[PDB]
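re: that complex we talked abt at group meeting.

here r the seqs, copy pasted straight from the sheet so there may be weird spacing, ignore it
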Amino acid sequence: SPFSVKVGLAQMLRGGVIMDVVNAEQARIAEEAGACAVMALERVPADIRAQGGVARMSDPQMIKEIKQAVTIPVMAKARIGHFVEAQILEAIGIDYIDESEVLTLADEDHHINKHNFRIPFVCGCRNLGEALRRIREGAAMIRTKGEAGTGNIIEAVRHVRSVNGDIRVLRNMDDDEVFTFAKKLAAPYDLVMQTKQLGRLPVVQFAAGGVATPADAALMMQLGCDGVFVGIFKSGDPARRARAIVQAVTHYSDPEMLVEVSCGLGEAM
Amino acid sequence: SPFSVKVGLAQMLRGGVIMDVVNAEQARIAEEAGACAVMALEGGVARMSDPQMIKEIKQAVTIPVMAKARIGHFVEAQILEAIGIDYIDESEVLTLADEDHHINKHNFRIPFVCGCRNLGEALRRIREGAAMIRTKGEAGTGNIIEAVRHVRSVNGDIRVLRNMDDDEVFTFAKKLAAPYDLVMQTKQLGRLPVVQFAAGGVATPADAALMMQLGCDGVFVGIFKSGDPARRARAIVQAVTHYSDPEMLVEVSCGLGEA
Amino acid sequence: SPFSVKVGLAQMLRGGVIMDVVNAEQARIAEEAGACAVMALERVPADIRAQGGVARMSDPQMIKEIKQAVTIPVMAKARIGHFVEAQILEAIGIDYIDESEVLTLADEDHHINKHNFRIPFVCGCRNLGEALRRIREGAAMIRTKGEAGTGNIIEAVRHVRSVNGDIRVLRNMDDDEVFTFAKKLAAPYDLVMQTKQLGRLPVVQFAAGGVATPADAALMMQLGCDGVFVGIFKSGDPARRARAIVQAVTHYSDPEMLVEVSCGLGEAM
Amino acid sequence: PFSVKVGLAQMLRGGVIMDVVNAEQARIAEEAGACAVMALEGGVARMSDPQMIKEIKQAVTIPVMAKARIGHFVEAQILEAIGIDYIDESEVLTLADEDHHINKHNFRIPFVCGCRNLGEALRRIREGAAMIRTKGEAGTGNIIEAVRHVRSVNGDIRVLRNMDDDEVFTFAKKLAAPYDLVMQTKQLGRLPVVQFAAGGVATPADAALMMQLGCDGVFVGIFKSGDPARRARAIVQAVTHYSDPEMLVEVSCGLGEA
Amino acid sequence: HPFSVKVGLAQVLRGGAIVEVSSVNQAKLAESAGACSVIVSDGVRRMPDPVLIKEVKRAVSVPVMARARVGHFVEAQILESLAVDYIDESEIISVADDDHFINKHNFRSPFICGCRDTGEALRRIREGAAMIRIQGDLTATGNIAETVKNVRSLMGEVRVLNNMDDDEVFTFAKKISAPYDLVAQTKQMGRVPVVQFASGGITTPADAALMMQLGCDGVFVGPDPFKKLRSIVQAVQHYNDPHVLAEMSSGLENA
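got the structure back, here u go
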């Protein structure tokens, strides 16, 4: 199915670090540090929080520029429910669309119908039910989000453990009890069983929220994620830091390497 | 057993004073004043310190070097262990990384220090691997009232446990929500199965001696926040060694300056 | 008993005015005005309240100096429960130790065991039960405290009337009802009966809190206290004021004298 | 004189005190080996008719007790003038003074007082109780509450025994008990007076359980059974051999309906 | 270990029904129907009269159990003296100690204890229970609903634990107020370390077989007894055979 294909397209991101960028230079520094993809937006989450106002899809212009500066995939955020911001991103020719809850919610009751699109979608989640609902709507990739623009990783850890926790519970669960579990999760029974059989999320699952240091990124990988988002430029030296985080994800099970890439990284956010 | 060994490592700190340090300078001033060990660290999220500054400290002094890791941040711990720290402090004074779980400390070769406010919590930390318990009061206030509360709390329950009817210990373990094995082991020894220091608020020689007189094996200090750190540091160190000697306590507290 | 002796030692203070001091000069001005004793501390209660921070035992140095400047007894404050601050004061050779609740409480649940000391203790109280508990712990002298560092005497009056009120109730009480009274007071039955028989506190009882003018001090004496604490230097002219208060306590039942010593005293706190 | 009354009570250790409402029973009780009897006879419940108390005091040779309503010091004056050995100021009778207990020091005869916790025990003692009974539920045949109170008192005593001396002042406050008696209790490592169990003791097993918990004896209200004489003797034997399960099996064997 | 031995004793009861009896007559019937054991019982409910327990023991050759009140360690001393095979510290009779159960490690006789969830079960085992009965309704409600609830809760938590991240097991032990080492053991075995019988409301062959299909090791049971009892024994023995279950239930009389 066209959904099977989108899901496949995301597999190439496993082992990656996606980075937020606000211009070319940054996108170049992001690829130069080894980022598997960049996420274009006119304001980093930390600035969104500290500033306020309404955060919307970024101006195509600044998206076209970024998409011409790098060779790695280019992502862009569309307000939740704003299916027209999406259409515009699709038309612009981006690789992935992030229906992102760090932007200003546009529809309080309904997410974008992502199936109506040929371009893959990333959706945020905080627990297993929320992930399975996003997937049923078409999401090809899931990022379990903690808190955004704080540099604190605690909520990301809570959510990762939440999703992976229930997945493990689900795997060993008595078949006759899964129906009730689906109800309690408020998630489609089909996807629940597909998650049971598979023993994991039927799509790529990244961590996001407060990932500031190499240790943070490696922690997410050891918890069972497929990669991390970083919203790096709010630190002392972006390049060195961005490189260190990339390396941390690639060498997440190697403390000696982790010590190496963490040494004299500069001031974190 | 590996755990027993870690516990043994922490016993070479008894009767000592552990001091927080942020630079090599402070570390020396700390060792110069007779600190048993130094603790490396630098609002805003508080995380493990840069290995760079940790390495510089471990290369300035010949006493054991400790460092903090965020609660539940097992990767930070791994990084500290890989750089040859003597002790890891899974400390609540840093920004909690995991709300529901602590680091599984058994999975490490380096001994851990954990904080606690009561017996049950101390025993849970120990069951997770902790080799040394820090009974923590208030952080960064200079007021020891909370430390006194917790020390009395832990030591109070330990004494209750010592003389308790054996048929009632099961229910007691439940009420503490602590592992029964360790509860009985605590009953037997008549004390905590590991080294116990006090931390939080210790600002004067008298404070430190009070902790020792209550039963603590030693104290943490968080010094340079005083007028003459070198002087205040030595006084506290002497206070801990001569905690039952008023004449001495008067001699080291005299003209200490702004505390 | 050694407790009978400490209690005796305090009898010499009856009819006295104890004054807080922060240095020599003051201690000298306090004795020069006729204070029965001085209380050494590095901050007056009014400043403790207006400033904050943690108020602890004062540095011995500043205590040794004061104790060498005057010939009248010298007191010092030890945080409640801080039995090591006490030990240090005892070793320093002070006359009395005030386990004082104007300093920063060190132990929320237990007062210092005062019997373990050869040096007499003063403890604060607010009612009869609280006084009898302090006494049982070893306190040789009691000061019923109102509010500290406000210059308002209202709470001191409330407490004095409280303690003296129950003492009078206790004296005429049916013997068979005293047990229950002790329970309600939460005070040792022995001391309650000893208070009943005696018709007053079995130890010296001073007033403290908000005593600003001569009239205030004389009021405390007419209510039945044995003397007053003053925390004088926060006024216009300490000397004249300190002298006036001393005289007021000595001539508390003499309005003509009270008018004399109150005239043109300067600005009070 | 108080230390004399206390001694007079220590005699009863290892005994079973049985309720009785007439001579026949008093004899059926002494004949079973009771260490003393307790004379009695909805609706207000008061002291028993002296006559019946004299009929019992002259029918047996073991000590004779009697109940006096809590706070009713005149019911006690009457019991004393009757010449009985022990007065039990008992809460099973209709409370007479809700605020004050009898001043028992004003009496020659020893007093028993009930309690549910250590503070309550120490207060009764300070009022002059020479003996303390930890009471559970009265007249239910259920010992659950007695077990609770026994463990409560013995529990705090063990806590007090090993407690830091400095912290005892505050402990006395929380118990609402006299400091002197608390420190005393801490020194002795037990109640400074004889301590029995009472309430819901129906079977021999119950009686032995109380002893194993650490009581000096038990009260029984046996007569509510199908065969008094047999039951009484069994309970008496149970208290005497409270460590001998093999013995406890015999005395519990076919004792009829409880 | 002496505990391993006790745990080994209870294991012989697997696949069986335990019938509560109140006389030598009922005990004999129960044995004839193939009960693996009988549990003796005679307002406050107490340990049964030792005379009755002796008569039952003599009248049958299957193991004999008897009840003690919760926390009544003397009653348990008595039962162990007259030589019963198992003691059930049973919440069905009147609790004697609201705060503490019997220190079952002080006895040589194996103990059964009740439970309604995994934490409870493990606490009873740490006190020295050699066997656990997962209990529903305390009265004779003939309703199996609460029993099914508590069997599913126990079985379900065990499955959750089996697969749990090792690091998270400490908090899990805290949450269910259970001894960590026993939680760890249960995780390793993918099973509670002792025999586990369903109890409460078992009225029909279908009820009893349901409990077995839910994973229990056996069942306790509280106008034609001989037939009904035989039916339940057969049900437990052939719990996976619907055709047999059908035969067993046919004209069993009023339940």
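couple things i noticed - Chains D and A do not touch (no CB pair under 8 Å). Strands of chain D lie at 15-20, 36-39, 64-69, 86-90, 111-115, 131-135, 194-198, 217-220.
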